[PDB]
DNA sequence: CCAGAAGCGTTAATGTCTGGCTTCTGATAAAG
DNA sequence: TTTATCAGAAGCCAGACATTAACGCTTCTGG
């Protein structure tokens, strides 16, 4: 039995006023088309597949068209509410959807339900539980403590899963088919969750973390990883739909699909010389889509109007400014002078070469500046 | 609004955990209740995790967060408190709590833990901070903002109210009733005149006289004539609170642009005279008339049933002190839990129920009684 | 031929902070249970479906639980869209409403089909004409539906399939310039909407509205809720049937002063009423606004009511004026004079529906 | 610095010309001095006479200039405060004044005569505003605000010091000094980067630059703030003596920060660094009380100033620290600085016998004192 | 019964500044 | 760990006021 995990769609989601509608959609193709290629019966989307409980209107449009068009191919889908969306946003439509084999379970002590297969066979044995709001498991009780709040939380959700399992051991019964669970967590500042405490499940998929990562060393519980980078630590990565194919009940196979990345982003590092030559690589080439950037610059020069000398660079060229950073966090005030001088007795020559022996500057700019300084003094006598 | 129960723990000088409750044999009645204790050892705290618990910011701090928490004793590893406030017959909680890093008294600090729990059902409601203060500004269906000003009055800020900023005093004005159109009318009409400026770089007269009479960035304009006639609404129920507080002195809504509230002087046959030449007893008493009335103005929609209040008894004269405390025991006659504290030895005999405050030998903390520890 | 005929839903409307949940939840049932009891045809709403364009969350979840429990009717449903209803907030689910027997709506007429599958009658889908999309403004309303006519009578050609006629506009001549009643074209039937009032207009039966299912205001507290239940006869409308819905809140609108008022209160006096009886209770005192409450929240206590608004009809507060007779009153120290006053008050109403 | 005579007539509820000297017997004697009665007798207005006439200004108001006297005691014609004090050894008087429009309770407020003449010499050394306001910065050593935040403390207003924004407590700390000269480099440093600047609708724009980020640009700011940062080292380690002195509470030290702050240390504790935000009520008095003081014996060198004028803030105290705090300010009236404060506490009469005692006239709404004082 | 002077009360140019406002870099809370 | 979002700071424009400088009204007051 096939299936698809993805997860952290973030639909909706404003990117330093840009979108990823275009980019989202292109995407949703792409795991449409995927489908009936590998002839998957039922897609699993664990999580986040809203950014905000209120999204813009559009952002219904890319996730209705999708619900549609999969039933084309008349394969099932999960979907999860993740910690972003509000569960009210999701519950609008788990009545409705049932009627095209989308079972959006938005709370929290749903029922375990049968995946079916496309011939109409049960395919697989489904734990849906998507992200635990701590309110729909636990009351908050008087007396209590600072710490204790986090691991009597930590102890509910635990004995959730141990519940949640029990009821599909009774549901599974005999025949031979396998256990799907999902879950928006994190797991292995203690504030997670210990995999040895999840369920005795065939294979878990999970959400909530965007590197796609296996998690403790057992490879049926994987982080699937956003399905395109939403961020510029991990816009360089690679993102990979989790395919699953399960054997007589137990798991086969964990193959991972690459997306084809529609939007091309790039972070640079260093100084403005630096920032130059990694802008040159743009130069001969052409971008249909808009090449982004961030700009962490490390430097130590005033540089003046810093924005415009990116702005300077890139006119004529397919690149998109998009952020630009400085780390214009720095100190700087007066020592103790030996904790003795008067502030009358030092000259003005003496407190400005207290000042500049705080900065880095060694020689030619120095007695530039030093010249710079001393106009002023003779300026006013 | 009163409160029911108090919990805290190495907030300040006050070490190790305590609690305070408003259900007890003490505070039997509702009356009004005094803290004692020596001068600087743990006096506000007890009023400060009121506000810490319910909108995390205290009068003095201005923010406590996973950077600049300097509200936390030294050598303590975390702190917390914890409110049961009440409205409109129902409890509830909040529960503000940070730990440190490792659990040692020199780490980082932690991201703060919040709760808003219901007392009944046990339930919580808004597990993250960012709800937690919208979800009590529909609550109490006053403000932090409101709160510092129309409940609770810290040391020192009796100054609150009548010598702010008039775009201050109308926005908190603006935020009790009305309706926050009646500045967003001013910024979409200032966004009006730039676009239509922005053009241009009879059209001047489309958003040029309209701009100059009603319209300026963030709702200043149209929001100060609107206020206007709450302010003239409002010195009513000043005037009413104050007659039975201290005769002498009248209220009267000054006609101009700023609105400021105007003294009328009976013992000078109806002079007026601005309201910052006032004596330190008389602005004392007409914020304390002001913040009273200004809990009354919408006591309609959500009912306001307590009033904390620090030193200005020692900046009161000593005979009309007696006055203005059975003035206030007048106002005990609602049911209005009074919190007062301050150090006048003829105050603190005329109030029965003291929470003493004992500062500790040397130790370099303070503590309570037996029946609150914990 | 049966078709249900509602209008101006306003679903999640916000209602002095108090909400109409409950209300159409005990409509909604009522609405398919009818249809459930007669086997209509299809049913339509004439616009004014959701509140705003940003409806709250939980106002879905009432709708979408009508398509649902549509489901097991096999009746087809046709949305229209509305004045306050903007096209985002209908292309949500333009085209999951597809595979449930939901046409929902610059469009080409449609044919309804039957629930034994026979073509039934002939639809004229018409949304709100906004002129931002198409004097002027009302030449090029009054040739549409001639323009439109000509699409429903050409569609049929000699078939015998009834026309009815769709929209969401205002009309001269209905007490609440506005389309001409006169130049309605005339189909089989006209449905319509955004008029709340329930009556029938210009004294042609084929030309209706139906107005709101439910009352919205305290001063609309009109025993009149109604819903159109229309019968054709092969091509031609046979007579409408005003369905009285139930009610379920009931609201008083007592006048006068704290004398005639104070022995009004005594008529729901241990009554016992298992919804919280709405008031708009109109005091004319010349006493202050935020003081005359505070007698009336002890008065109402005692009573099973809950007062929701209170306002003198005849000082003032921020709470009881209009934002032009403030705006009017900030006209004081400014020269209205002649063509000064007029953009003035021309522009200002412009610029309260921009945010609105 | 201390004054030696004060002689006002329709202050606010002081009718009648009422005087008082401190060459009299009772203030000859020692320079500390209480003031109490019934609150709102003017014994502000007693302590804001003589801000009045050197500066035409009061802490409660704003400007008392030709519109808006707020001041003068209701329907009356004239108000007029007038002051005999000391610099250097030798005397001065400032003598402000105001009329209504023709000797009428009411009418148009003219416009203010003053004069600052030298006593004992009969030479009318200013006569206007502005030259009086200037010749008696000159001659007294202090501005308007050294004088409202370290020579005379209004009620409520002693943590303007402690908890002022950066600008206006280097502002106060820059004018101490003689080295007013910074807010005039800093200045001159964005005079010539804004007009190289705006030449270019260069590199030497980029060197102008790079020091305007190195130092202040439009008034002082940033090479101000660093400079004025030894004047404050200088001056907390003043005040960490004045305050062990005081009260053995806490120390004060510096803060390595661009905003010109000083954080606490706590002795019990031996290593307490928090912000003074979070002090205490009655320590917060405590170290603006220090601090004040160790402000004015800063400018020791130069027009050496000696008097104090608490007005409020020791009631904040008890029995357990007022008492260790006016036994310390004894200490301070055993040397050259006659101090004078208001007090409402009744436990500072043992303390104090040197009273202005004042009266109500049985709620008619003026006041007086003792007739010795009256004229 | 009064005119000159002396002072007093009045208005018209100009210098500082308090208040929007805007442009910006800094903090805060939240999803990896 | 990074990303919207608000919050505070520094600088710019400007009208509002404070001040100074000049111009009639009243009043002793002398014959
Ligand atoms: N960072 C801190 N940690 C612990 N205790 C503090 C801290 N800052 C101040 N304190 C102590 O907390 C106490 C608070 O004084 P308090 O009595 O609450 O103020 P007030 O006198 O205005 O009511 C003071 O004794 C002070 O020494
Ligand atoms: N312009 C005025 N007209 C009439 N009365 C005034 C005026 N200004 C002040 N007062 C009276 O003078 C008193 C000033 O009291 P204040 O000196 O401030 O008391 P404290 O010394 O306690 O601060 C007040 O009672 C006030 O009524
Ligand atoms: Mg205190
Ligand atoms: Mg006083
Ligand atoms: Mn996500
Ligand atoms: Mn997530
Ligand atoms: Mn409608
Ligand atoms: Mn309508």
Known sequence: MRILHTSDWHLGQNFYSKSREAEHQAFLDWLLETAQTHQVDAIIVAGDVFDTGSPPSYARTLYNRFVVNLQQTGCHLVVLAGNSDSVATLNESRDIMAFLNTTVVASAGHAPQILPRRDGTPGAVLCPIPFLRPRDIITSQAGLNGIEKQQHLLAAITDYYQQHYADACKLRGDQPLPIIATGHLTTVTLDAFPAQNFPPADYIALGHIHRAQIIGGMEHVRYCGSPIPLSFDECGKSKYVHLVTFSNGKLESVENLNVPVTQPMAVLKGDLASITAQLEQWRDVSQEPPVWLDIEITTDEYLHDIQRKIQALTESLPVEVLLVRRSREQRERVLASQQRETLSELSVEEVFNRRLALEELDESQQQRLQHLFTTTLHTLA | ?374
């Open chain 2, 1 to 374: 609004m009163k409160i029911l129960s108090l919990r805290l723990k190495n907030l300040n000088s006050l070490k190790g955990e305590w609690k305070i409750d408003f259900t007890r044999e003490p505070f039997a009645s509702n009356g009004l209740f005094a803290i004692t204790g020596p001068t600087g050892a743990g006096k506000t705290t007890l009023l400060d995790a009121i506000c810490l618990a319910l909108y995390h910011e205290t009068p003095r701090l201005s923010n406590v967060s996973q950077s600049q928490n300097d509200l936390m004793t030294r050598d303590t590893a975390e702190c917390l408190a914890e409110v049961e406030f009440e409205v409109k017959g129902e409890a509830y909680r909040a529960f503000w709590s940070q730990n440190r890093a490792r659990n040692q008294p020199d780490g980082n600090l932690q991201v703060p833990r919040v709760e808003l729990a219901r007392c009944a059902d046990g339930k919580i409601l808004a597990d993250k901070v960012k709800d937690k203060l919208e979800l009590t500004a529909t609550l109490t269906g006053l403000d932090y903002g409101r709160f510092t000003r129309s409940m609770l009055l810290s040391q020192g800020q009796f100054a609150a109210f009548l010598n702010a900023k008039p775009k201050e005093r109308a926005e908190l004005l603006e935020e009790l009733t009305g309706t926050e159109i009646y500045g967003q009318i001013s910024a979409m009409v200032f966004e009006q005149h730039k676009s239509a400026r922005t053009e241009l770089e009879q059209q001047v007269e489309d958003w040029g006289y309209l701009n100059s009479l009603i319209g300026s960035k963030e709702g200043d304009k149209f929001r100060k004539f609107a206020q206007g006639l709450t302010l003239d609404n409002l010195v009513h129920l000043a005037n009413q609170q104050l007659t039975r507080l201290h005769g002498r002195y009248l209220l009267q809504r000054k006609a101009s642009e700023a609105l400021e509230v105007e003294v009328v002087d009976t013992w000078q046959a109806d002079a007026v005279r601005d309201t910052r030449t006032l004596s330190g007893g008389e602005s004392f008493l007409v914020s304390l008339a002001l913040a009273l009335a200004l809990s009354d103005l919408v006591s309609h929609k959500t009912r306001i049933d307590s009033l904390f209040l620090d030193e200005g008894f020692g900046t009161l004269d000593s005979e009309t002190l007696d006055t203005a405390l059975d003035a206030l025991d007048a106002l005990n006659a609602s049911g209005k839990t009074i919190g007062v504290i301050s150090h006048v030895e003829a105050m603190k005999e005329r109030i029965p129920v003291q929470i003493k405050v004992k500062k500790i030998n040397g130790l370099g903390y303070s503590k309570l009684e037996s029946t609150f520890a914990v």
